[PDB]
Amino acid sequence: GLAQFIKVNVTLENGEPVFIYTDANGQVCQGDITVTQAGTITYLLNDQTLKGLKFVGVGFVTPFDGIIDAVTISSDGMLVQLVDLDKTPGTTKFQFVLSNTANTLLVLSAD
């Protein structure tokens, strides 16, 4: 199994969140992952917004498609991990879901 690692950097531009993914080499990427065997994807939050962002989960418009088997979250909301057993072939799209300390609205990454 492979364990892949992406950093989720969140900045504000024009007062709103911008999500910039970096890979283990420090390169900006799309945070997309191809899974070619059973493995994990670990996302680490680097919140530079001053809005107190914490992960609360990972959201899917097609949550029963079988592409991702499970989501785990750390107690401090700085990490989410995806389990992908890579049995079902195909593609899924997801949005990070975060709380913030400025208001009671949840924050989503781009569709």
Partner: peptide, 7 residues
């Protein structure tokens, strides 16, 4: 982001 499974 998107995940692509190629099993």
């Amino acid at each position: 982001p998107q995940i692509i499974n190629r099993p």
